[PDB]
């Protein structure tokens, strides 16, 4: 062991390095304390002919352009044309880069932490919603098993069906089970007055989904803008829409946060929406029958003082060709006039009274 | 001049009181807050600034897009202020 | 309550150290310390002058 006796000197040199890094690593707090302003960064690779070529183009908020190479600490998500970077008074070096927003009108579209309703609020849809509950639970907790089996969850699920069925409050009810950040987005929001806004909205959606923590982005009314016209505004929505499909087709690292979509009608079906990353999960959600409407209306009305003498035959007969949110409006209306009816207990005539009231 | 007489005699302590309250960075308004230490602020000159919160202002008293007094030397928020027609 | 007529003696040591320190005089605030010996009331002599590491505070 005489040859291994020199390792002690090496360990003393290494622990001496750990003893001497406290000062030069301690000045990181006083030099990198606070970037006083915000400056935009534009990446531009240079060539010096080590003597290697590496540079970047800087633009300050006060419209002043300077010169500086690519510097700082170990960069992994950096080197992109972003904003909100670290900068000193006049040295103009890059110390702390963090991606920034602005145009808060799109950043704060729907800031929801978690909803209140859960999946146990409906009745008679487990045979078709269980695939989605699995498709949101197993890709969140069973990421370890995805390497033994080599499974990548799909990113596009088509939640299509007739309107009024509750395709938004139910997907939100499953978003309560996702436990991730919920972020809504409307179809018509892409149609703006200025040019090129849809690119900023799409790259913003993948900017918060790509940059932020694992979240949930549910969109709706996609059919209202998914028109395949052959000037035209829906062809501009083909520029933005086909741009989004290009970001769901040309991006293999799209294994991150999913993009859930829902269409209120499948009349104008875009044929280019078929792909593993695109809307491949096509589970048909038809109009609930009087039995299913009595189930979702019973579980949605399990909180009000409902009379126990309900055979569901009269309401089952009156509810003809109705939807889920329509019976939800009947439940809410019953909870509205049942107050002014004097009797604190919900009666049986209030069902048809609400059906003929709002419809 | 009669109104400026008693205030002119009361202008002596304005020299010893000139050292404080001198801070004025054009009352720059903030935009949002990613984390509690660092606050993203934008001045009226279209220059976005970032500074840490001072010890004289509580973090619960900060509102989104609120015009408050802020230093131009230490860049910190000394004191807020309550204030269209 | 008494005052005299003082005059600061400046050799080439402090001068050249303030010239190299002026070459290192970046826009960022810098710090330095002067040394010397006090022989009487109305004269002051500087001999040793060095620089100080910069800081974000200035």
């Amino acid at each position: 062991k005489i040859m291994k006796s020199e390792v002690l000197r090496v360990t003393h040199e290494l622990q001496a390095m750990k003893d001497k890094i406290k000062e030069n690593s301690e000045k990181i707090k006083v030099n990198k304390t606070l970037p006083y302003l915000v400056s935009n960064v534009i990446e531009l690779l240079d060539v010096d002919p080590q003597r290697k070529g590496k540079c970047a183009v800087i633009k300050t908020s006060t419209r002043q352009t300077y010169f500086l190479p690519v510097i700082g600490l170990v960069d992994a998500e950096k080197l992109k044309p972003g904003d909100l970077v670290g900068v000193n008074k006049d040295s103009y070096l890059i110390l702390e880069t963090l991606p920034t927003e602005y145009d808060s009108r799109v950043k704060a579209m729907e800031v929801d932490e978690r909803p209140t309703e859960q999946y146990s609020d409906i009745g008679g849809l487990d045979k078709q919603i269980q695939e989605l509950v699995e498709a949101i639970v197993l890709p969140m907790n069973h990421k370890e098993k995805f390497e033994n089996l080599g499974i990548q969850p799909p990113k596009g699920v088509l939640m299509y069906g007739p309107p009024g069925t509750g395709k938004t409050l139910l997907a939100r009810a499953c978003a309560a089970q996702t436990k991730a950040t919920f972020l809504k987005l409307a179809g018509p929001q892409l149609v703006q007055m200025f040019i090129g806004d849809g690119a900023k909205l799409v790259r913003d959606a993948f900017a918060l989904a790509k940059e932020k923590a694992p979240s949930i982005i549910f969109i709706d009314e996609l059919d209202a803008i998914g028109t395949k016209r052959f000037k035209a505004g829906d062809r501009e929505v083909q520029r933005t829409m086909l741009e989004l499909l290009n970001q769901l087709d040309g991006f293999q690292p799209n294994t991150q946060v999913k993009v859930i979509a829902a269409t209120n009608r499948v009349d104008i079906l875009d044929p280019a929406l078929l792909r593993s990353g695109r809307l491949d999960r096509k589970i048909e959600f038809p109009m609930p029958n009087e039995e299913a409407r009595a189930r979702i209306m019973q579980i949605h009305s399990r909180k009000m003082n409902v009379s126990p003498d309900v055979n569901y035959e009269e309401l089952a007969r009156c509810t003809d060709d109705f939807n889920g949110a329509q019976c939800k409006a009947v439940c809410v209306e019953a909870g509205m006039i049942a107050l002014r009816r004097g009797a604190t207990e919900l009666t049986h005539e209030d069902y048809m009274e609400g059906i003929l009231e709002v419809q | 001049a009669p109104p400026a007489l008693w205030d002119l005699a009361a202008d002596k302590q304005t020299l010893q009181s000139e050292q404080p309250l001198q801070v004025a960075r054009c009352t720059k308004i903030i935009n949002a807050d990613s984390e509690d230490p660092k606050y993203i602020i934008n001045v009226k000159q279209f220059a976005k600034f970032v500074v840490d919160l001072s010890d004289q202002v509580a973090p619960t008293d900060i509102e989104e897009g609120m015009r408050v007094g802020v230093d131009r030397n230490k860049y910190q928020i000394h004191i807020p202020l309550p204030p269209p027609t | 309550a008494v005052d005299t007529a003082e005059q600061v003696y400046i050799s080439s040591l402090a001068l050249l150290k303030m010239l190299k320190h002026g070459r290192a005089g970046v826009p960022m605030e810098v710090m330095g310390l002067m040394l010397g010996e006090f022989v009487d009331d109305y004269t002051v002599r500087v001999i040793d002058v060095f620089a100080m590491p910069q800081s974000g505070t200035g």
Side-chain angles (χ1 to χ4, degrees), chain A residues 28-204:
Chain A
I28 304 299
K29 296 182 289 294
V30 299
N31 292 116
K32 266 66 70 177
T33 164
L34 52 100
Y36 79 109
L37 56 75
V38 176
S39 179
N40 193 1
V41 177
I42 293 172
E43 181 64 27
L44 190 146
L45 183 62
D46 199 359
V47 51
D48 185 74
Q50 183 66 41
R51 298 293 296 163
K52 62 183 181 293
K54 189 182 287 185
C55 180
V57 176
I58 195 71
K59 272 93 170 65
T60 62
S61 296
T62 182
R63 290 188 295 272
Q64 292 179 356
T65 303
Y66 294 97
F67 188 77
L68 58 96
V70 173
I71 53 175
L73 270 300
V74 176
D75 293 332
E77 292 86 4
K78 285 90 171 65
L79 277 301
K80 65 182 182 294
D83 206 2
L84 192 63
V85 300
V87 60
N88 291 116
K89 299 295 186 291
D90 207 1
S91 69
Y92 295 159
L93 58 92
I94 296 170
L95 54 95
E96 183 178 1
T97 298
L98 187 68
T100 302
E101 37 71 29
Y102 99 63
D103 182 2
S104 179
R105 64 178 176 88
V106 185
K107 181 177 62 295
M109 45 174 73
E110 289 292 328
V111 180
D112 185 74
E113 290 85 4
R114 83 276 292 160
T116 62
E117 67 271 15
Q118 69 273 16
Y119 73 99
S120 296
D121 290 331
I122 50 95
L125 281 79
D126 291 331
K127 66 182 288 185
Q128 59 186 358
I129 203 172
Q130 187 176 2
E131 184 67 28
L132 183 63
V133 173
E134 291 177 353
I136 63 172
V137 168
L138 71 91
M140 189 67 204
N141 199 3
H142 294 89
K143 292 292 290 182
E144 291 85 4
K145 292 178 71 67
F146 286 164
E147 295 293 327
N148 290 319
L149 297 167
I151 303 299
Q152 297 295 321
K155 306 299 173 181
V157 50
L158 183 60
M159 188 175 180
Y160 66 97
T165 321
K167 296 183 289 294
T168 302
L169 277 76
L170 187 62
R172 191 184 298 114
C174 295
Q177 297 294 321
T178 61
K179 201 64 70 177
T181 301
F182 185 62
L183 295 172
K184 283 176 70 176
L185 180 61
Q189 289 297 110
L190 293 174
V191 178
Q192 298 294 321
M193 180 181 176
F194 291 162
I195 62 171
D197 287 332
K200 185 173 73 176
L201 267 70
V202 169
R203 293 177 67 88
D204 193 358

Side-chain angles (χ1 to χ4, degrees), chain A residues 173-355:
Chain A
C174 295
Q177 297 294 321
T178 61
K179 201 64 70 177
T181 301
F182 185 62
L183 295 172
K184 283 176 70 176
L185 180 61
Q189 289 297 110
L190 293 174
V191 178
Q192 298 294 321
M193 180 181 176
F194 291 162
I195 62 171
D197 287 332
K200 185 173 73 176
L201 267 70
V202 169
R203 293 177 67 88
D204 193 358
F206 273 168
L208 267 69
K210 183 77 176 177
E211 173 188 358
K212 265 64 186 299
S215 64
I216 294 295
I217 293 95
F218 171 73
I219 68 171
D220 198 359
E221 288 92 9
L222 186 63
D223 57 351
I225 61 171
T227 302
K228 49 180 184 293
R229 289 184 181 178
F230 296 99
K231 67 182 291 294
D234 289 332
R235 182 167 50 82
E236 307 170 355
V237 195
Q238 285 178 357
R239 181 185 68 184
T240 299
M241 182 178 71
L242 284 174
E243 183 179 1
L244 178 63
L245 271 68
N246 193 8
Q247 293 183 358
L248 269 75
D249 196 3
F251 287 164
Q252 55 181 357
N254 207 166
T255 62
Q256 209 174 1
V257 175
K258 285 82 174 174
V259 176
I260 302 170
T263 62
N264 290 318
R265 192 173 179 179
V266 292
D267 52 355
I268 305 299
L269 183 62
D270 194 1
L273 291 176
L274 295 174
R275 191 184 179 272
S276 179
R278 293 178 182 176
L279 300 173
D280 197 3
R281 298 291 180 90
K282 294 187 287 184
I283 302 169
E284 198 267 329
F285 285 165
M287 295 175 72
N289 291 318
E290 66 271 15
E291 292 86 4
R293 288 191 297 266
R295 290 180 185 271
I296 58 98
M297 187 178 71
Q298 181 179 2
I299 308 299
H300 283 168
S301 67
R302 71 182 293 275
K303 189 181 264 77
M304 291 74 167
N305 291 318
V306 180
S307 66
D309 194 1
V310 172
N311 296 115
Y312 296 99
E313 193 272 331
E314 181 67 28
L315 57 92
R317 179 64 179 171
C318 293
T319 53
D320 290 332
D321 291 331
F322 287 168
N323 290 318
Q326 298 180 358
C327 292
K328 289 176 68 67
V330 175
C331 180
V332 171
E333 184 68 27
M336 285 295 289
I337 79 155
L339 177 59
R340 63 178 62 91
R341 281 178 65 88
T344 185
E345 187 176 2
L346 183 63
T347 187
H348 187 74
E349 293 86 4
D350 202 353
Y351 295 100
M352 62 179 287
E353 204 282 336
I355 291 169

